[PDB]
């Protein structure tokens, strides 16, 4: 496929960007609306929902189980119930959320539902979640993708001892549907300990918004009581993860980018995000119906802990590679990344060193020494964030091309255009 030329910013970037809806929130909302429907509480709507390959998959996975999902723009309507036909087969595709949030759903089904995916999907961790479903009543065929959920009519619940070291999504998947389990659920996470805490906290927060009663007062443990999941109107925030790619442009150019409609009240870790930016001496600014970041004139190496916002590593690794020459940055708390279908630690190291950079894995993550970069082909590995990280570097390095910018379609179909409008 042809490459994408990453446009340069030889002068400070000035711009106002609208980023599409949160992928995390959208999919939680679809699963909850699905549940509400199946319980028989009527249709739900999702306003400003993200329309992307990842949400399309959840959409699809959801229609396969029996629900009806309509809406062609940002406004989805969810109705129906869980009635898969004989031989149903959910394609998880590239959506790790489909892989982990939808199998519990099917447990609430009567017929067996197969779960399948591509090569990449298949190298995704999913076992502790499969065993957990077994522990809690569900009959499950397979130890990996593809597997079969043998739904009978309901799910017991009870308490499981699952190690969600491998993915918070194991916990969130269980939590979202546990309201409709028989004995509800009590998830216990073992040892230490939850990387991606905000991801589980976004789920807890949305559950409560749906009127579910969840108890998360003692760390590493969640108690969800059986009860109704409410049909309602979900308002989706702009994806703050994707917004950071855009803000990075202001950071590396000493410029200014405004993100419209930045939520003052978030289910997203906006706090963590702005703090990271202030670490670079970026100037944050709450503007008129926007979030405004003014990049510094330059910046040296930083030590940043990313354990709670692991998804930010590629954009942040890029920022580090573009620090003042000689600067040493250490990206910590992301040991747990080293083991996702897409090892971004190794990915990032590989791609940055191929440009003449210096990026070495450390036991806790990465150390990046800022060294002069050279033209080259930034490989995204079909990883939307790897794609956007290459885009950021290309702002300060001429001749950088991303092999597959269309990997951004996973969470941000219009990235190329939005980036093109921002830079120019």
Swiss-Prot record:
Check the record and name the PANTHER family matching this protein.
AROM/DEHYDROQUINATE SYNTHASE, PENTAFUNCTIONAL AROM POLYPEPTIDE
- Please tell me whether the keyword Acetylation is annotated for this protein: no
The main location class comes to cytoplasm
Q: Which domain of life is it from?
A: Bacteria
Q: What is the lineage of its organism?
A: Bacteria, Bacillati, Actinomycetota, Actinomycetes, Mycobacteriales
* Pathway the protein takes part in: Metabolic intermediate biosynthesis; chorismate biosynthesis; chorismate from D-erythrose 4-phosphate and phosphoenolpyruvate: step 6/7
Write down what this protein is called: 3-phosphoshikimate 1-carboxyvinyltransferase
Q: Residues that bind phosphoenolpyruvate, according to the entry? A: 23, 96, 124, 169, 344, 385, 410
- What SUPFAM superfamilies does the entry give? EPT/RTPC-like
